[PDB]
Amino acid sequence: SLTHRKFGGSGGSPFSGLSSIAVRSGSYLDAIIIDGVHHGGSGGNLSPTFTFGSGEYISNMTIRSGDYIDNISFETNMGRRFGPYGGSGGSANTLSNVKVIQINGSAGDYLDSLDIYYEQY
Amino acid sequence: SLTHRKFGGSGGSPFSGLSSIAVRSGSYLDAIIIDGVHHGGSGGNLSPTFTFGSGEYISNMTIRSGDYIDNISFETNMGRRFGPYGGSGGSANTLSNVKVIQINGSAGDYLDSLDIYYEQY
Ligand SMILES: OC[C@H]1O[C@H](OC[C@H]2O[C@H](O)[C@@H](O)[C@@H](O)[C@@H]2O)[C@@H](O)[C@@H](O)[C@@H]1O
Ligand SMILES: OC[C@H]1O[C@H](OC[C@H]2O[C@H](O)[C@@H](O)[C@@H](O)[C@@H]2O)[C@@H](O)[C@@H](O)[C@@H]1O
Ligand SMILES: OC[C@H]1O[C@H](OC[C@H]2O[C@H](O)[C@@H](O)[C@@H](O)[C@@H]2O)[C@@H](O)[C@@H](O)[C@@H]1O
Ligand SMILES: OC[C@H]1O[C@H](OC[C@H]2O[C@H](O)[C@@H](O)[C@@H](O)[C@@H]2O)[C@@H](O)[C@@H](O)[C@@H]1O
Ligand SMILES: OC[C@H]1O[C@H](OC[C@H]2O[C@H](O)[C@@H](O)[C@@H](O)[C@@H]2O)[C@@H](O)[C@@H](O)[C@@H]1O
Ligand SMILES: OC[C@H]1O[C@H](OC[C@H]2O[C@H](O)[C@@H](O)[C@@H](O)[C@@H]2O)[C@@H](O)[C@@H](O)[C@@H]1O
């Protein structure tokens, strides 16, 4: 059921809960690091951390996936790019004209899966 | 249009991007701190940090609000409680039998507003 509700008044400036992202990656995604928390194994190489600016969100996103997440890249509403990181296995899926709200998933020694919650425009 | 999609396989342990919450509070919520990141001003007193265990999420939430967020409390599916923190003003609203996915909002000197993304059951 993805829904939302707003509480409170009109002032202040917006913020998002999803503030930064890095991955460890080789032939697949070994890990995803979200707001500085690590999920997945120790294999592969650690990427730079992408930290969202104020009012910046993921608008375009590409994931390769089979049994695991094989690869990820994304772009933001401000033309900033992350990746691609990972291998060529899996099949490509793309999200276009979106605003990503949250990234959940499941992870063992590898990044098994990703659940992306988002708005579709 | 709010949506979600899962990519990849079914192994691994589930994880959420929303891993921890603390607030600064006095009369109002001065700030909320999401995965260590501060949103709001410097006032009030800093709460302890609530960190979600694996597969733990917010299932019930009372927020009092007016022009700002006056008070927050929540219970998780595991029976753990955070708060109440803040004061007596505003009006109460409750989310009940939900699973909160993400906490966005707006903040200045204080926590003006919360935008809660959740699934309703
Ligand atoms: O991201 C997965 C791994 O990617 C690279 O390893 C490639 C292969 O190396 C050896 O053949 C075996 O370990 C295979 O399992 C593996 O696919 C490395 O960067 C590794 O550290 C990653 O875990
Ligand atoms: O997401 C990873 C892979 O998912 C699928 O499974 C390929 C399988 O190949 C062999 O059976 C073993 O190496 C298994 O570990 C592996 O899952 C495919 O879509 C593949 O292209 C992906 O790389
Ligand atoms: O992220 C991949 C898996 O991670 C953990 O299990 C790893 C095990 O997979 C197979 O049982 C064998 O290849 C073992 O050698 C290996 O340790 C679990 O979280 C699992 O659910 C994931 O699929
Ligand atoms: O949570 C907001 C503030 O709550 C308390 O402020 C008490 C009083 O301070 C000043 O007299 C005015 O701001 C009044 O409106 C307010 O009731 C304190 O904990 C303060 O530190 C917080 O910022
Ligand atoms: O959520 C905060 C309050 O919002 C409304 O009150 C507006 C006025 O409250 C106090 O007089 C000061 O903070 C003023 O700056 C502000 O304009 C009411 O809904 C109240 O009940 C809330 O506590
Ligand atoms: O978080 C509450 C507000 O924080 C900032 O500014 C504080 C302003 O509060 C009242 O509008 C007046 O007392 C002003 O003098 C004072 O600067 C702003 O970010 C505002 O948008 C927030 O509502």
Curated annotation (Swiss-Prot), chains A, B:
Domain Jacalin-type lectin: 1-120
Keywords noted in UniProt: Lectin, Mannose-binding
Top-level division of the source organism's lineage: Eukaryota
Pfam family, one: Jacalin
UniProt xrefs under SUPFAM superfamilies: Mannose-binding lectins
GO molecular function: carbohydrate binding; D-glucose binding; D-mannose binding; identical protein binding; N-acetylgalactosamine binding
N-terminal signal peptide: none
Family according to the record: Belongs to the jacalin lectin family.
Function in brief: Mixed specificity lectin with anti-HIV activity. Binds to HIV envelope glycoproteins, including exterior membrane glycoprotein gp120, and inhibits viral entry into cells. Binding to gp120 is dependent on gp120 being glycosylated, and is inhibited by mannose, glucose and N-acetylglucosamine.
Protein name stated in the entry: Griffithsin
Upper taxonomic lineage: Eukaryota, Rhodophyta, Florideophyceae, Rhodymeniophycidae, Ceramiales
